[PDB]
């Protein structure tokens, strides 16, 4: 296939049905970090390879959602598509920002605790948690948490200074908008 998005431009696609054993595997990589596996192990799980001018992306599609990557660190993270479609219940936490975090976060900007003003779930420092603009609910954001959810939970009350998530994938990054036409 062949797509052309914002920001990224003309992408040149190879996809691919994953094999049972890399399905098994998928499986085993995503449950020390999330609550449970969010989709069925009967959805149609494939590979999508897309170069760009700059390089290449590679994302598992769930039954044609574009939802998972491998990030640097060797672990498997959502897309912000991939929270759309399947909800983030099923990550250990979420952290709910004010609209200016909200904002920050979709240009690209790390979550400071000043913006944060809610904490669902149990999490530690290290876990993959979604940044959610608390108003609407709309997840704006996927990161590392860099403090645990019950030390967070505390200082954002305070309103203490210092950073609270990591990002890794964000609304309008180059990732999400070619996920975005993936899904188209």
């Given at each position: ?60 599609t769930v039954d044609g959602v574009p939802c ?13 598509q991939c929270?759309?479609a399947f ?96 899904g188209?």
């Amino acid at each position: 296939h062949m797509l052309w998005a914002r920001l990224v431009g003309l992408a040149r696609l190879e996809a691919r049905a994953l094999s049972k054993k890399e399905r098994r595997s998928l499986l085993e990589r995503l449950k020390p970090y999330y609550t449970r596996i969010p989709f069925s192990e009967k959805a149609d799980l494939r590979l999508v390879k897309a170069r760009t001018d700059s390089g290449e992306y590679e994302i598992i599609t769930v039954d044609g959602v574009p939802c998972l990557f491998e990030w640097s660190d060797g672990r498997i993270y959502p897309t912000l598509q991939c929270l759309k479609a399947f909800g983030v219940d099923w990550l250990k936490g979420v952290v709910l920002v004010d609209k200016g975090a909200a904002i920050a976060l979709a240009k690209g900007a790390h979550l400071m605790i000043p913006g944060v003003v809610g904490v669902e779930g149990s999490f530690t420092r290290g876990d993959v948690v979604a940044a959610l603009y608390h108003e609407t609910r709309t997840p704006v954001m996927v990161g590392v948490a860099e403090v645990d959810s019950s030390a967070l939970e505390k200082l954002y009350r305070e309103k203490a200074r210092g950073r609270a998530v990591r990002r890794v994938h964000r609304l309008g990054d180059a990732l999400w908008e070619l996920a975005q036409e993936v899904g188209k």
